[PDB]
Ligand binder design. Sequence first.
Ligand SMILES: *[C@@H]1O[C@H](CO)[C@@H](O[C@@H]2O[C@H](CO)[C@@H](O[C@@H]3O[C@H](CO[C@H]4O[C@H](CO[C@H]5O[C@H](CO)[C@@H](O)[C@H](O)[C@@H]5O)[C@@H](O)[C@H](O)[C@@H]4O)[C@@H](O)[C@H](O[C@H]4O[C@H](CO)[C@@H](O)[C@H](O)[C@@H]4O[C@H]4O[C@H](CO)[C@@H](O)[C@H](O)[C@@H]4O)[C@@H]3O)[C@H](O)[C@H]2NC(C)=O)[C@H](O)[C@H]1NC(C)=O
Ligand SMILES: *[C@@H]1O[C@H](CO)[C@@H](O[C@@H]2O[C@H](CO)[C@@H](O[C@@H]3O[C@H](CO[C@H]4O[C@H](CO[C@H]5O[C@H](CO)[C@@H](O)[C@H](O)[C@@H]5O)[C@@H](O)[C@H](O)[C@@H]4O)[C@@H](O)[C@H](O[C@H]4O[C@H](CO)[C@@H](O)[C@H](O)[C@@H]4O[C@H]4O[C@H](CO)[C@@H](O)[C@H](O)[C@@H]4O)[C@@H]3O)[C@H](O)[C@H]2NC(C)=O)[C@H](O)[C@H]1NC(C)=O
Ligand SMILES: *[C@@H]1O[C@H](CO)[C@@H](O[C@@H]2O[C@H](CO)[C@@H](O[C@@H]3O[C@H](CO[C@H]4O[C@H](CO[C@H]5O[C@H](CO)[C@@H](O)[C@H](O)[C@@H]5O)[C@@H](O)[C@H](O)[C@@H]4O)[C@@H](O)[C@H](O[C@H]4O[C@H](CO)[C@@H](O)[C@H](O)[C@@H]4O[C@H]4O[C@H](CO)[C@@H](O)[C@H](O)[C@@H]4O)[C@@H]3O)[C@H](O)[C@H]2NC(C)=O)[C@H](O)[C@H]1NC(C)=O
Ligand SMILES: *[C@@H]1O[C@H](CO[C@@H]2O[C@@H](C)[C@@H](O)[C@@H](O)[C@@H]2O)[C@@H](O[C@@H]2O[C@H](CO)[C@@H](O[C@@H]3O[C@H](CO)[C@@H](O)[C@H](O[C@H]4O[C@H](CO)[C@@H](O)[C@H](O)[C@@H]4O)[C@@H]3O)[C@H](O)[C@H]2NC(C)=O)[C@H](O)[C@H]1NC(C)=O
Ligand SMILES: *[C@@H]1O[C@H](CO[C@@H]2O[C@@H](C)[C@@H](O)[C@@H](O)[C@@H]2O)[C@@H](O[C@@H]2O[C@H](CO)[C@@H](O[C@@H]3O[C@H](CO)[C@@H](O)[C@H](O[C@H]4O[C@H](CO)[C@@H](O)[C@H](O)[C@@H]4O)[C@@H]3O)[C@H](O)[C@H]2NC(C)=O)[C@H](O)[C@H]1NC(C)=O
Ligand SMILES: *[C@@H]1O[C@H](CO[C@@H]2O[C@@H](C)[C@@H](O)[C@@H](O)[C@@H]2O)[C@@H](O[C@@H]2O[C@H](CO)[C@@H](O[C@@H]3O[C@H](CO)[C@@H](O)[C@H](O[C@H]4O[C@H](CO)[C@@H](O)[C@H](O)[C@@H]4O)[C@@H]3O)[C@H](O)[C@H]2NC(C)=O)[C@H](O)[C@H]1NC(C)=O
Ligand SMILES: *[C@@H]1O[C@H](CO)[C@@H](O[C@@H]2O[C@H](CO)[C@@H](O)[C@H](O)[C@H]2NC(C)=O)[C@H](O)[C@H]1NC(C)=O
Ligand SMILES: *[C@@H]1O[C@H](CO)[C@@H](O)[C@H](O)[C@H]1NC(C)=O
Ligand SMILES: *[C@@H]1O[C@H](CO)[C@@H](O)[C@H](O)[C@H]1NC(C)=O
Ligand SMILES: *[C@@H]1O[C@H](CO)[C@@H](O)[C@H](O)[C@H]1NC(C)=O
Ligand SMILES: *[C@@H]1O[C@H](CO)[C@@H](O)[C@H](O)[C@H]1NC(C)=O
Ligand SMILES: *[C@@H]1O[C@H](CO)[C@@H](O)[C@H](O)[C@H]1NC(C)=O
Ligand SMILES: *[C@@H]1O[C@H](CO)[C@@H](O)[C@H](O)[C@H]1NC(C)=O
Ligand SMILES: *[C@@H]1O[C@H](CO)[C@@H](O)[C@H](O)[C@H]1NC(C)=O
Ligand SMILES: *[C@@H]1O[C@H](CO)[C@@H](O)[C@H](O)[C@H]1NC(C)=O
Ligand SMILES: *[C@@H]1O[C@H](CO)[C@@H](O)[C@H](O)[C@H]1NC(C)=O
Ligand SMILES: *[C@@H]1O[C@H](CO)[C@@H](O)[C@H](O)[C@H]1NC(C)=O
Ligand SMILES: *[C@@H]1O[C@H](CO)[C@@H](O)[C@H](O)[C@H]1NC(C)=O
Ligand SMILES: *[C@@H]1O[C@H](CO)[C@@H](O)[C@H](O)[C@H]1NC(C)=O
Ligand SMILES: *[C@@H]1O[C@H](CO)[C@@H](O)[C@H](O)[C@H]1NC(C)=O
Ligand code: NA
Lengths: 34, 34, 34, 178, 178, 178, 162, 162, 162
Amino acid sequence: VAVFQAIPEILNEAINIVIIVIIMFTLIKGVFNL
Amino acid sequence: VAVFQAIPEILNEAINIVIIVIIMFTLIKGVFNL
Amino acid sequence: VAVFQAIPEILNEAINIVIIVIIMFTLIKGVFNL
Amino acid sequence: KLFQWSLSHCLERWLIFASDIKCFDNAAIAKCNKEHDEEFCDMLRLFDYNKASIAKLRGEASSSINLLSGRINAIISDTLLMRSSLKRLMGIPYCNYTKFWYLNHTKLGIHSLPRCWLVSNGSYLNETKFTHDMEDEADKLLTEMLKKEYVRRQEKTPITLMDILMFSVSFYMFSVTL
Amino acid sequence: KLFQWSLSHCLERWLIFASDIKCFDNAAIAKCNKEHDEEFCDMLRLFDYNKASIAKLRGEASSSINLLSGRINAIISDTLLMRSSLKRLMGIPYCNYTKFWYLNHTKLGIHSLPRCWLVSNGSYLNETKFTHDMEDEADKLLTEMLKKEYVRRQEKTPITLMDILMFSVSFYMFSVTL
Amino acid sequence: KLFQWSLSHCLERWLIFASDIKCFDNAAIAKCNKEHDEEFCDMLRLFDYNKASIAKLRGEASSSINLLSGRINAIISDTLLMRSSLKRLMGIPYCNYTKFWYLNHTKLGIHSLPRCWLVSNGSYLNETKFTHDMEDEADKLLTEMLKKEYVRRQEKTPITLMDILMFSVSFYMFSVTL
Amino acid sequence: SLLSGFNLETVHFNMSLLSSIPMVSEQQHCIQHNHSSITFSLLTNKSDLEKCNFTRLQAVDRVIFDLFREFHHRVGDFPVTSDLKCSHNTSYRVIEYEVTKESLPRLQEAVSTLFPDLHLSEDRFLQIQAHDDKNCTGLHPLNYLRLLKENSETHYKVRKLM
Amino acid sequence: SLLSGFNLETVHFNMSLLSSIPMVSEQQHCIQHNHSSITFSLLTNKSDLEKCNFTRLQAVDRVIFDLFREFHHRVGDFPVTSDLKCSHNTSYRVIEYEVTKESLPRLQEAVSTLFPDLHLSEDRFLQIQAHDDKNCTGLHPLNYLRLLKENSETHYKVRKLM
Amino acid sequence: SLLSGFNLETVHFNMSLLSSIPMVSEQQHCIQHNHSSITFSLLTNKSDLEKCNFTRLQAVDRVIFDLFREFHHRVGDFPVTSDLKCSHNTSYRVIEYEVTKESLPRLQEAVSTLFPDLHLSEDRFLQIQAHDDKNCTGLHPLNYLRLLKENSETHYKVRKLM
Ligand SMILES: *[C@@H]1O[C@H](CO)[C@@H](O[C@@H]2O[C@H](CO)[C@@H](O[C@@H]3O[C@H](CO[C@H]4O[C@H](CO[C@H]5O[C@H](CO)[C@@H](O)[C@H](O)[C@@H]5O)[C@@H](O)[C@H](O)[C@@H]4O)[C@@H](O)[C@H](O[C@H]4O[C@H](CO)[C@@H](O)[C@H](O)[C@@H]4O[C@H]4O[C@H](CO)[C@@H](O)[C@H](O)[C@@H]4O)[C@@H]3O)[C@H](O)[C@H]2NC(C)=O)[C@H](O)[C@H]1NC(C)=O
Ligand SMILES: *[C@@H]1O[C@H](CO)[C@@H](O[C@@H]2O[C@H](CO)[C@@H](O[C@@H]3O[C@H](CO[C@H]4O[C@H](CO[C@H]5O[C@H](CO)[C@@H](O)[C@H](O)[C@@H]5O)[C@@H](O)[C@H](O)[C@@H]4O)[C@@H](O)[C@H](O[C@H]4O[C@H](CO)[C@@H](O)[C@H](O)[C@@H]4O[C@H]4O[C@H](CO)[C@@H](O)[C@H](O)[C@@H]4O)[C@@H]3O)[C@H](O)[C@H]2NC(C)=O)[C@H](O)[C@H]1NC(C)=O
Ligand SMILES: *[C@@H]1O[C@H](CO)[C@@H](O[C@@H]2O[C@H](CO)[C@@H](O[C@@H]3O[C@H](CO[C@H]4O[C@H](CO[C@H]5O[C@H](CO)[C@@H](O)[C@H](O)[C@@H]5O)[C@@H](O)[C@H](O)[C@@H]4O)[C@@H](O)[C@H](O[C@H]4O[C@H](CO)[C@@H](O)[C@H](O)[C@@H]4O[C@H]4O[C@H](CO)[C@@H](O)[C@H](O)[C@@H]4O)[C@@H]3O)[C@H](O)[C@H]2NC(C)=O)[C@H](O)[C@H]1NC(C)=O
Ligand SMILES: *[C@@H]1O[C@H](CO[C@@H]2O[C@@H](C)[C@@H](O)[C@@H](O)[C@@H]2O)[C@@H](O[C@@H]2O[C@H](CO)[C@@H](O[C@@H]3O[C@H](CO)[C@@H](O)[C@H](O[C@H]4O[C@H](CO)[C@@H](O)[C@H](O)[C@@H]4O)[C@@H]3O)[C@H](O)[C@H]2NC(C)=O)[C@H](O)[C@H]1NC(C)=O
Ligand SMILES: *[C@@H]1O[C@H](CO[C@@H]2O[C@@H](C)[C@@H](O)[C@@H](O)[C@@H]2O)[C@@H](O[C@@H]2O[C@H](CO)[C@@H](O[C@@H]3O[C@H](CO)[C@@H](O)[C@H](O[C@H]4O[C@H](CO)[C@@H](O)[C@H](O)[C@@H]4O)[C@@H]3O)[C@H](O)[C@H]2NC(C)=O)[C@H](O)[C@H]1NC(C)=O
Ligand SMILES: *[C@@H]1O[C@H](CO[C@@H]2O[C@@H](C)[C@@H](O)[C@@H](O)[C@@H]2O)[C@@H](O[C@@H]2O[C@H](CO)[C@@H](O[C@@H]3O[C@H](CO)[C@@H](O)[C@H](O[C@H]4O[C@H](CO)[C@@H](O)[C@H](O)[C@@H]4O)[C@@H]3O)[C@H](O)[C@H]2NC(C)=O)[C@H](O)[C@H]1NC(C)=O
Ligand SMILES: *[C@@H]1O[C@H](CO)[C@@H](O[C@@H]2O[C@H](CO)[C@@H](O)[C@H](O)[C@H]2NC(C)=O)[C@H](O)[C@H]1NC(C)=O
Ligand SMILES: *[C@@H]1O[C@H](CO)[C@@H](O)[C@H](O)[C@H]1NC(C)=O
Ligand SMILES: *[C@@H]1O[C@H](CO)[C@@H](O)[C@H](O)[C@H]1NC(C)=O
Ligand SMILES: *[C@@H]1O[C@H](CO)[C@@H](O)[C@H](O)[C@H]1NC(C)=O
Ligand SMILES: *[C@@H]1O[C@H](CO)[C@@H](O)[C@H](O)[C@H]1NC(C)=O
Ligand SMILES: *[C@@H]1O[C@H](CO)[C@@H](O)[C@H](O)[C@H]1NC(C)=O
Ligand SMILES: *[C@@H]1O[C@H](CO)[C@@H](O)[C@H](O)[C@H]1NC(C)=O
Ligand SMILES: *[C@@H]1O[C@H](CO)[C@@H](O)[C@H](O)[C@H]1NC(C)=O
Ligand SMILES: *[C@@H]1O[C@H](CO)[C@@H](O)[C@H](O)[C@H]1NC(C)=O
Ligand SMILES: *[C@@H]1O[C@H](CO)[C@@H](O)[C@H](O)[C@H]1NC(C)=O
Ligand SMILES: *[C@@H]1O[C@H](CO)[C@@H](O)[C@H](O)[C@H]1NC(C)=O
Ligand SMILES: *[C@@H]1O[C@H](CO)[C@@H](O)[C@H](O)[C@H]1NC(C)=O
Ligand SMILES: *[C@@H]1O[C@H](CO)[C@@H](O)[C@H](O)[C@H]1NC(C)=O
Ligand SMILES: *[C@@H]1O[C@H](CO)[C@@H](O)[C@H](O)[C@H]1NC(C)=O
Ligand code: NA
């Protein structure tokens, strides 16, 4: 649960938001294949 | 030969095994194209 | 403009040239789709 | 190494806690190996030297205190002791080496290296007068947690393997280009 | 922290510049927090102690100089002062703590931590006699710029997020494999 | 810098090896630039000061030893010398500054910074009594090899270029999404 | 804020096991090494003890000599007019310093290094009494390490100027 | 090269506000703490001042005592034959050291620690004159910190050998 | 294990070229700076040398004075009753310390700092003999640096207590 716990503290930084948005779009392409 | 020599020492770590398995599967897809 | 400014100083190193060539080829594939 | 004197804390109960915790994990004590600017680690060096002198100098009690003259800079930092003495003589809040505060994160479980509870005018400083240090130590805890995780990954992950990953993504892009 | 003595530079105009710059940004002064091997930071500690002694010891002037005996190693590094004295007595170019040169990059805007302008034979050394140090400091500026950028990214980017990125690229390759 | 005193080892044959190696590469000596807690580097500072005093103080032999009184902390670490003296007086194995062991990896070719061969009871310690230190130094060699490789890559690779790589993978995924 | 999630915990060291290092209890004006202790009392009456023969004190009671030696070197050049009287006695172990007007600055600058709240006054005596069984309360090494550092660095300033 | 893009800039500290720390102006042979200063003059004539009573000087003028104390401890064991004469005067504040043949090595090894270009000569006097209003020019703490470090580390070597 | 692949190699420094720094050969009880050496011999017979005039020794033989000065300061306050006899001779250079009962502790605490295996005994003399050509074997700077550090830090403890 360490991954989830750290996320709220430092979501402000832009780099972190940009990275997360890229990860989410990758999952969306996976759903598209299915 | 430095690449091969370092590999035996620290193959125990999971991350390293996961990375190597991904590399091997990439070569397999290359063979499939051929 | 920080990204562009740093580039001339250390373009000599091979790793940096290899990385840049890979980035350029990725853009070329994007143009091919278009 | 941190424990130079004692050669072949939790067992001997060096630290007393009011919170019901009885010991610190070995990593917590390791956090002082290269930390000569914190007085908690200096007291750890003093306790290590005490164990070593109890073991190797049990015979003569005269030598056990005739050796501490002009040799304290070997065991503890002279700079920290003299800074404490000067701040005490100037009236500035100083570290008297007695009380050590450390931020224990309840959820994540990580804690910070205990820092000295500065004392001024014969009374311990109120929490409200070093809360800036507490906030700095919390931010330091988060940043150093992530930095230490990166340091350990670099220590035990082949950088050549990472470059091979980069080249693998590269030629996978080359493959799907066709 | 760098400023141990003064507790609750630009405002008090500690630094004099011939270039028309009036102050350094807080990060420039922060660059000395863990730098005990540079005399510019030592002079910063001396000015901080001067502010603290002006504030807390304004009453008696006798104590303000009766406390500096055997307590300078608390404020400044003894090693640097004794190295300066020894180099001066040997004729080697030494740092007399007066002139400090720092490389200001005009375009990128970054500057280096001011280093001591070594003095030999009663005259400041010519630029041509430490230009190797200047080139080393320029290379250090570039390398430490990139290193500091990496350090800050590691400090404030979840390494677990990066591993999730790696696994995301992995299963995206798995997806397009079909 | 490591060599403060001598200004404008292999050539002068400072180090004697029984293994037929005649010198260390410049990086091996550089490994002491910021290492004040190892006695091999302290002896390197002593040899540098010896070269400087042979050059600049060849005239009067009286001054060459009238200057070493109260100025050794400039050349070598006082803490290490006093720790050696205290450990010697307590019977603890101490470093007498004579023998230095370093792990030379035959295949990879990297070696470790020479550490002091501790001496107890007038005889050098047997290998079996510090083999834990040898194992720690081997693990340190591997970890610090990978850490140094990462440090150099960060020093000479634009982090902005890496972020551009991340965004490039991102929009390549966006492209193949269509 | 950030500190809301974090909790403040207090760590205290176990000074009872610091037998080797001498510790200074300011609450009882006591320097204790192992089970041996020396108590600093501001007596108002003059004892009948003879002059201090330090070779004899070393031969007879090494414990008390070792205990007060750093304090005595922190006192520096004691005035000749002032009387330093040693018991030279195995059981009743007492070293009495006469707090004369000339001697008061040095003795105060030493006790304020060891026991900041001990205010020496003129026309009195500072009796250091050795006890082989007194367990002093409040023992911390800090003040003794300060004494050692002051002795090593500022020995010159406490010596006579002529 | 790399240095072509970079520019060399000079940083100078503002020593005028270093009131607490004593500073040493070698250009005027002056040690100044706050507004108080002591000037080292190589006088060629013998003053009529009496012998130095340092308790009286401390009682009377604390400023001058504090200013010259580190220098005096750097001089070490002054020869008895040599004459150290103190004014003990609130207005005309002067401490004169006789530069005898026996005393010249110590006095030179002290002035060369403070003022390297002051070459003391035999058959003269070193007058330290206190001024409550003289603003000395060239004040830097460096030499006084060197004096303090030499006093703390090498006090033994400046004491008499028998 | 990990250490199986790695090999243990020994590095020894070349002390022969350390001409500037004095080195201490404990095998020959010798302190050598450059080609000059001083040998510490426990003589059983009393020499006819006169009392030590250190100004004259400095004027005459600077080499021997510089060589033994740190050791002499490590001896501290030599007893007046004990006899320190200097040759004051260019060729036969000998400084003899009388190991009296009172002087034996200081001389032993100094030789054990320099030469731990030299056990001084009462009713003897410690002769430091200067040689301009003796090449002593086993020269390491370590003991002389220990001597310098002990002199700088613990000079107080080796001075008389009254
Ligand atoms: C370090 O310091 C300590 C502390 O100061 C010194 O210890 C002191 O040592 C003294 C010398 O030995 C000693 O004096 C003699 O001690 C004996 C009695 O001591 C015990 O009792 C006293 C209290 O005394 C009273 O009570 C007892 C009974 O309880 C009676 O016997 C006494 O008479 C008194 O009524 C306690 O304080 C002690 O702790 C002991 O328990 C006796 O030998 C001796 O008494 C003789 O002298 C008296 C006057 O001095 C006299 O009144 C009495 O009648 C005795 O006279 C006999 O002996 C003399 C020769 O001396 C002779 O001429 C007479 O004809 C007759 O035969 C002394 O009192 C101290 O008592 C003792 N103090 C303490 C507190 O222990 C220690 O010596 C010192 N170390 C060194 C090396 O100097
Ligand atoms: C710390 O050191 C300083 C510096 O050395 C000491 O300061 C000195 O103190 C002396 C003692 O008090 C003092 O001597 C008396 O001072 C008075 C005059 O001082 C002023 O003038 C002098 C110059 O003197 C000339 O000019 C004035 C007028 O401008 C005339 O009045 C004088 O006669 C002279 O012509 C300046 O230098 C000072 O700065 C002052 O401005 C007088 O009280 C006194 O004069 C009497 O003595 C003279 C000889 O000593 C004599 O010629 C004259 O006629 C006077 O004689 C009267 O008094 C005597 C008793 O002393 C009596 O027998 C006679 O019958 C008659 O009534 C002195 O000159 C110094 O002047 C002063 N120096 C300086 C530079 O300030 C200071 O004391 C010392 N501190 C301590 C604690 O010792
Ligand atoms: C630092 O210490 C060193 C070491 O102690 C001192 O060096 C000593 O200095 C002495 C004073 O100058 C010196 O004594 C005179 O030296 C001369 C001979 O020295 C050589 O020979 C001796 C051995 O002597 C024997 O052998 C030689 C021949 O080989 C014969 O000539 C001798 O007679 C002996 O048989 C070696 O040890 C030296 O190394 C030298 O090679 C002579 O001038 C002189 O002899 C005279 O005195 C003798 C008794 O003292 C006497 O028996 C002899 O007959 C001579 O008498 C003549 O002179 C006297 C006046 O003195 C006069 O009354 C007579 O009528 C007659 O004319 C001395 O022996 C030491 O020899 C020398 N020692 C060493 C080891 O070198 C050094 O001085 C000192 N430094 C200072 C500044 O004090
Ligand atoms: C500091 O103290 C020491 C030691 O103290 C001694 O032991 C204590 C336990 C206690 O009993 C003390 O009273 C005692 O002195 C002092 O050193 C002693 O000094 C005395 C006096 O000089 C010596 O006695 C003399 O020693 C010689 C023989 O050893 C000889 O000169 C003398 O004998 C001749 O004279 C006597 C008469 O007095 C006569 O009986 C003899 O037959 C002969 O003619 C005399 O005995 C002690 O031996 C010394 N003891 C030691 C251990 O050194 C020291 O003096 C003192 N310091 C000061 C400054 O006072
Ligand atoms: C260093 O200086 C101090 C203090 O100096 C004093 O003050 C200065 C401002 C200046 O005025 C100096 O001249 C002055 O001395 C010296 O300490 C003083 O020493 C003297 C001499 O011993 C003392 O005077 C005596 O003190 C006692 C009473 O307090 C008593 O013994 C004497 O009185 C008897 O004798 C006188 C005759 O002289 C007679 O008038 C009386 O009626 C009585 O019989 C005499 O007054 C001072 O009190 C001391 N002052 C202080 C403050 O301690 C010190 O001696 C000197 N050091 C050296 C080495 O010379
Ligand atoms: C330590 O040693 C120094 C120097 O030693 C000197 O040189 C050595 C190489 C060796 O020869 C020694 O014997 C020699 O002393 C000593 O300093 C010397 O001290 C003496 C004695 O005081 C001085 O001699 C006197 O000096 C004055 C003139 O310079 C004058 O007082 C005397 O002359 C009068 O008396 C003589 C009779 O003795 C007579 O002949 C004259 O005509 C006149 O009336 C006398 O010459 C030396 O000059 C000093 N030398 C130096 C270089 O300073 C020092 O005393 C000694 N220390 C101790 C504690 O003993
Ligand atoms: C490095 O050089 C630049 C360019 O000269 C400096 O920028 C100046 O900054 C001062 C202070 O704010 C301004 O008054 C000037 O107008 C600026 N000049 C220009 C041309 O923009 C910069 O401050 C220098 N950096 C350092 C650390 O000295
Ligand atoms: C200090 O240590 C001793 C010995 O281990 C132990 O018995 C004691 O309880 C400790 N003190 C405290 C207050 O915990
Ligand atoms: C303390 O005293 C005890 C006996 O009471 C002894 O066993 C122990 O060794 C002593 N400790 C020291 C450090 O001298
Ligand atoms: C530290 O200060 C506190 C203030 O109350 C005090 O209780 C404690 O004993 C002090 N410790 C020392 C060693 O002075
Ligand atoms: C030094 O500081 C003072 C006080 O802030 C200021 O007035 C003065 O101008 C400064 N000196 C220089 C040369 O800038
Ligand atoms: C310097 O003197 C002034 C008065 O001139 C005083 O207000 C100030 O406190 C003094 N400063 C120090 C550090 O003693
Ligand atoms: C430093 O050296 C220069 C050389 O010209 C000199 O002007 C300056 O005053 C010196 N500073 C000190 C503190 O010696
Ligand atoms: C020490 O150095 C000298 C001078 O370079 C050289 O000749 C000598 O061989 C060296 N000693 C050893 C034992 O290698
Ligand atoms: C050592 O002595 C030689 C002559 O034998 C001289 O040339 C050299 O300078 C001396 N070295 C030192 C460091 O004094
Ligand atoms: C170090 O110890 C060894 C033990 O045999 C000895 O041979 C060597 O000379 C020693 N060196 C010093 C400087 O004591
Ligand atoms: C003091 O502590 C000791 C053990 O260190 C114990 O035997 C004794 O009872 C305690 N109390 C007193 C009053 O001595
Ligand atoms: C020293 O005094 C003499 C004799 O009075 C005088 O001629 C000379 O000018 C004075 N020198 C100085 C520098 O005042
Ligand atoms: C010296 O500086 C002070 C202020 O520190 C000022 O009042 C005075 O005018 C200046 N000049 C002189 C000559 O005293
Ligand atoms: C000692 O070494 C020197 C050179 O340093 C040499 O000339 C001499 O022959 C050697 N041997 C002796 C016995 O002096
Ligand atoms: Na020191």
